[PDB]
Amino acid sequence: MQTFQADLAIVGAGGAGLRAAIAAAQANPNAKIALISKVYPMRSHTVAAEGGSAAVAQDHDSFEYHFHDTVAGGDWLCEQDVVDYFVHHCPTEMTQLELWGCPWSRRPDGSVNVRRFGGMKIERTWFAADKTGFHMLHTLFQTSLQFPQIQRFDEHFVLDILVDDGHVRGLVAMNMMEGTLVQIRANAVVMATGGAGRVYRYNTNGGIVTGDGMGMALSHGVPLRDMEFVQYHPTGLPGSGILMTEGCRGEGGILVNKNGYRYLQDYGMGPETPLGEPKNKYMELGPRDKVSQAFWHEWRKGNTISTPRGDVVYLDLRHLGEKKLHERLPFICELAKAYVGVDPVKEPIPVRPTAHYTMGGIETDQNCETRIKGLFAVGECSSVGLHGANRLGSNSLAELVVFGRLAGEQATERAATAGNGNEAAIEAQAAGVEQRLKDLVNQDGGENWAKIRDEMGLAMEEGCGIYRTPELMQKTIDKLAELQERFKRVRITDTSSVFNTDLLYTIELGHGLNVAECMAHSAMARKESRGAHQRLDEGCTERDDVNFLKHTLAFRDADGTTRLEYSDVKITTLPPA
Amino acid sequence: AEMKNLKIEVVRYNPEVDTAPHSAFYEVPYDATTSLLDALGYIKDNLAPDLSYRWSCRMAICGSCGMMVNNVPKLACKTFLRDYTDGMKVEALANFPIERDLVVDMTHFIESLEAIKPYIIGNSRTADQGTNIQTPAQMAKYHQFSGCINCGLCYAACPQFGLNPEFIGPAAITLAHRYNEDSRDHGKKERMAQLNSQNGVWSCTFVGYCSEVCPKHVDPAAAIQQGKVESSKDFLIATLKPR
Amino acid sequence: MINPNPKRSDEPVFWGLFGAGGMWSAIIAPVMILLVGILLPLGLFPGDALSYERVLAFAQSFIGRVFLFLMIVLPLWCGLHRMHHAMHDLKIHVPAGKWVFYGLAAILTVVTLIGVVTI
Amino acid sequence: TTKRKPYVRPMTSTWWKKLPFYRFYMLREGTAVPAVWFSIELIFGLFALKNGPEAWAGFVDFLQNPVIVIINLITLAAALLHTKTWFELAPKAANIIVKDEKMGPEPIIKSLWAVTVVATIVILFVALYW
Numbered sequence A: 001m002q003t004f005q006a007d008l009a010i011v012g013a014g015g016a017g018l019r020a021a022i023a024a025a026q027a028n029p030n031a032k033i034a035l036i037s038k039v040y041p042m043r044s045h046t047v048a049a050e051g052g053s054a055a056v057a058q059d060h061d062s063f064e065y066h067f068h069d070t071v072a073g074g075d076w077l078c079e080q081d082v083v084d085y086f087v088h089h090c091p092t093e094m095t096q097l098e099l100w101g102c103p104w105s106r107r108p109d110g111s112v113n114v115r116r117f118g119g120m121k122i123e124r125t126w127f128a129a130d131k132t133g134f135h136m137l138h139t140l141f142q143t144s145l146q147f148p149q150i151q152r153f154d155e156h157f158v159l160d161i162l163v164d165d166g167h168v169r170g171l172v173a174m175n176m177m178e179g180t181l182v183q184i185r186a187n188a189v190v191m192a193t194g195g196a197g198r199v200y201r202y203n204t205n206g207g208i209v210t211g212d213g214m215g216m217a218l219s220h221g222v223p224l225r226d227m228e229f230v231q232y233h234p235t236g237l238p239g240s241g242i243l244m245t246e247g248c249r250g251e252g253g254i255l256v257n258k259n260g261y262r263y264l265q266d267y268g269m270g271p272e273t274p275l276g277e278p279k280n281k282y283m284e285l286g287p288r289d290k291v292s293q294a295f296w297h298e299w300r301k302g303n304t305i306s307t308p309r310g311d312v313v314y315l316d317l318r319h320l321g322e323k324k325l326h327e328r329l330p331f332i333c334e335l336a337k338a339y340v341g342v343d344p345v346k347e348p349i350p351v352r353p354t355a356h357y358t359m360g361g362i363e364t365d366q367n368c369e370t371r372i373k374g375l376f377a378v379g380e381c382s383s384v385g386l387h388g389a390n391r392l393g394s395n396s397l398a399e400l401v402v403f404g405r406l407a408g409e410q411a412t413e414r415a416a417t418a419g420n421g422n423e424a425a426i427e428a429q430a431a432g433v434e435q436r437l438k439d440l441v442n443q444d445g446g447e448n449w450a451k452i453r454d455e456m457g458l459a460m461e462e463g464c465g466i467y468r469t470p471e472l473m474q475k476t477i478d479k480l481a482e483l484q485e486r487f488k489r490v491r492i493t494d495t496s497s498v499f500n501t502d503l504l505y506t507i508e509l510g511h512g513l514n515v516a517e518c519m520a521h522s523a524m525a526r527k528e529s530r531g532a533h534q535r536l537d538e539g540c541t542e543r544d545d546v547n548f549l550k551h552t553l554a555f556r557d558a559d560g561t562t563r564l565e566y567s568d569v570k571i572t573t574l575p576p577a
Numbered sequence B: 001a002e003m004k005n006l007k008i009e010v011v012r013y014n015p016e017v018d019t020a021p022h023s024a025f026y027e028v029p030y031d032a033t034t035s036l037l038d039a040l041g042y043i044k045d046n047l048a049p050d051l052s053y054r055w056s057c058r059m060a061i062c063g064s065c066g067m068m069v070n071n072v073p074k075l076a077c078k079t080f081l082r083d084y085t086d087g088m089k090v091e092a093l094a095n096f097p098i099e100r101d102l103v104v105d106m107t108h109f110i111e112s113l114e115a116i117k118p119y120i121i122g123n124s125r126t127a128d129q130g131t132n133i134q135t136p137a138q139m140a141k142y143h144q145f146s147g148c149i150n151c152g153l154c155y156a157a158c159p160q161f162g163l164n165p166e167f168i169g170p171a172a173i174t175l176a177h178r179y180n181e182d183s184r185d186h187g188k189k190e191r192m193a194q195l196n197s198q199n200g201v202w203s204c205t206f207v208g209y210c211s212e213v214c215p216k217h218v219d220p221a222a223a224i225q226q227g228k229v230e231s232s233k234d235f236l237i238a239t240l241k242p243r
Numbered sequence C: 001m002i003n004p005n006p007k008r009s010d011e012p013v014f015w016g017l018f019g020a021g022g023m024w025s026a027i028i029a030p031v032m033i034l035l036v037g038i039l040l041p042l043g044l045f046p047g048d049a050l051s052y053e054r055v056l057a058f059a060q061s062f063i064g065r066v067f068l069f070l071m072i073v074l075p076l077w078c079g080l081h082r083m084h085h086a087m088h089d090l091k092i093h094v095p096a097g098k099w100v101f102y103g104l105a106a107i108l109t110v111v112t113l114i115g116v117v118t119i
Numbered sequence D: 001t002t003k004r005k006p007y008v009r010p011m012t013s014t015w016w017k018k019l020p021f022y023r024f025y026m027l028r029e030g031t032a033v034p035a036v037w038f039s040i041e042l043i044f045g046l047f048a049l050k051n052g053p054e055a056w057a058g059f060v061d062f063l064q065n066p067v068i069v070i071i072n073l074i075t076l077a078a079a080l081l082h083t084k085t086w087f088e089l090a091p092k093a094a095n096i097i098v099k100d101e102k103m104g105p106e107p108i109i110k111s112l113w114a115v116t117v118v119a120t121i122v123i124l125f126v127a128l129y130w
Ligand SMILES: Cc1cc2nc3c(=O)[nH]c(=O)nc-3n(C[C@H](O)[C@H](O)[C@H](O)COP(=O)(O)OP(=O)(O)OC[C@H]3O[C@@H](n4cnc5c(N)ncnc54)[C@H](O)[C@@H]3O)c2cc1C
Pocket: A011, A012, A013, A014, A015, A016, A017, A036, A037, A038, A039, A040, A041, A043, A044, A045, A046, A047, A048, A049, A050, A051, A052, A053, A054, A132, A133, A156, A157, A158, A159, A192, A193, A194, A195, A204, A205, A206, A208, A209, A212, A213, A243, A356, A357, A378, A379, A380, A381, A393, A394, A395, A396, A397, A398, A400
């Protein structure tokens, strides 16, 4: 194994990863930072984000409104000490993004425009057309080029981290093109690998979002926080699960059933609003969960239109007209045209709720540090205590820049204070990695990886849905256990070394199953209904602050068991009632 | 019901075993909605599990998709089988060295992008002072050019790049032009050299095929032209500077 | 691999010229090929508009001289410029390309300049 | 040592023969030939015109040789093609914002043909009419 020295190593070149990269280079110019990514930095899932990044900008706004909004939308599972900090650095970070060249859509007076997302009463969502992610990531990536300090490792698959004596000391990654292993020594390491949306059968996520980092963290004693909370997006294309931005419904789009009935009024979100002026919290703009839940019910009544792609409801956008559509909905216009064959001005688009955002992730303090000194998690793969039981729409992209920076800065200090570990046990850890790999290559059995995949995705959908019942959560837990077993009987047929994807996809599948197990186990153990977690069984249908105002922590022991702990929820100035 | 099948030719190449890329054929089931990326995946899961390719977004936004299809630079995730009933040949992105299967060395492209300093330059403004002012009119100047997904189709398209691998190429130029035309940036001088080189804008004979294939409708050809004009302005100033 | 700081290209002069060249040639050559190429040699003209007397009267006027010069020279720079690049694209190896083509232009420019300062 | 053997496909002299989009580009560039051919003709013309009536007549005789005519017709076809394609490309050099949008190529294309038409007439007028 070729060895590389670094002051700190970032795993993941997404938005948060890059934001940490830059942060680190500005905080110490003489640093050797290793930016490591299994794809090129501008391929990261972040680029597909369309809605926008949230930050207090309007005169009549207040950070306390942003705060309230988060904690309330988070159903009081937020770390209020963390939320407070987060809101306070949103404008700073959004402004700075503008400063580096992000082309935010502007008011005619040439200042940044903002729109409403995630139900926030006051609109504080900064946006660039509907390619906000694309601009943010590209801005961040293109920015990162001007720091000599950042050494990039593109198309490098991170296999494991190195740890001894409660401290991270490096990592081991494959050079994907060459097929050889590498070891980067760093006294502090940032996990920015994004979430695990890809463990569901239907989801809005890019193929690369497979939970790797989380899985890695699992292998070292680090728990995953609040993995039961998984957010579906009310409106996704059938089949692909391709996201149609809420912006559709903000501009006045309507959701109808097989009788062209606007059904949402019949579910507590009525009285039907006129086609012209939609209203926040009413009808199509009702709260997220209620809109998805309503789909389920409508399907129960047999009111869904049935396509070969699946049972769907209609998102009607015709009444918007040509001009209104191309100014704000051009991307949504081309997607629907391409992937379902629908001109949104000519006819309605099929939609159905789809798996979207992983609220859960790697446990971290207010400083993004995990229980392993020098090891950090940030962004979708992490849990800083920001989102609680439900993330506010547009707070995620905001989080990348806000905490990305914090992480880059915090990791800089741990790398400076490190002192040395024991190189023998460290080089042994690496021998360990290398060996576990040869273990997976040589493994025989003739189980097809793609079927264990196909089947995990299925169990996730059927067991961990909008609505959840003990019977199904159990069947999923069970199913996962077999698949975990079957996984050990998988044969990687492709033995080549130049860009072996058969191998890579298989490793990510490994991680999926560990993570999947943590959602499923967490979900079942939560005998209550909170946020994205909705149980139908008796005495679990409502919010329980008496017994369940606590985060779920899921650990994975060497024996392969998924074990749960609970921890308290820091509250400052906003106790529930 | 019963799904129709399609005989899809895919040019395989393994550097360890093969001396040259060789065709391979795969029956894929499809319907109206099936993309090539979908097809590729079916092959990997079912037929040839050593079939390596790049993808991610599945919605023509990340840019990792790019390959040749019946000799046209296209995006797997946006190419639909329903259109290729009469035979479909799939090849690695043209004008790039094939590394393995549908996976090409994108290096020159990366270094190219990097060389034009694609980032705001010489703006001393700081975050506490709030954001720069920029009108929709000012944005309109560079906006369209800011939508490149670094897919690289426009390079497989470009016969000048094909004949001069040292030509920084349509994307790179476009991306530079975007920053030069950003009202917020003052690093034009820092970018001209690269654009002014023979390998810069001056390698473009305006075939204009770049803009034709560009899945993101960026019209890089137009930026290269606009860059030709700027290089000439720049040439004159520097001829008339005796200073 | 991509070099740190490249050398400025010369092309903006030739491109400048070829610019004017292609523009003039585009607006004006059509008419001109029609007259000289078709109308004159086929006698399809009113009375003696294209008689040897009248052409000469014009050719010897100030305007006419300037006009014929541009008319001959501008398309030369454009067209030769293009043929030079056609060599590369057609993968033909040409000794002293710039000197051959752009030289040829300069000569015929002169030959013409002489011609319209009168022979 | 490395197991990868990056394969580089060779670009052949005939590359443009493949795809029609390229052929059309070759054709566009083909218009340079007749352009100069014609400019050359004008030179003979110009000098024969200076060597008096007898030489000019033998120049006008040249332009009557059935082959020359056929070539000059082609010259005109070339010319028009050059004009049409040129008019499509020049507008791309402009970056012009008319109230908050980037103006298309069409407004300029039209102006350019408008000017071409006026010129075409004005010359045909002055040449033939007086
Ligand atoms: C369609 C869609 C729209 C969205 N819109 C919005 C929005 O409008 N507003 C908002 O706030 N949020 C939005 N989100 C959520 C938000 O986009 C994501 O949570 C956020 O982009 C995650 O950024 P990240 O850096 O944490 O993850 P990513 O940006 O996905 O990070 C991925 C990076 O980690 C790397 N990586 C992963 N595993 C490995 C490995 N094993 N080895 C090496 N590298 C690895 C990848 O190569 C890549 O570089 C949206 C999400 C989706 C799916």
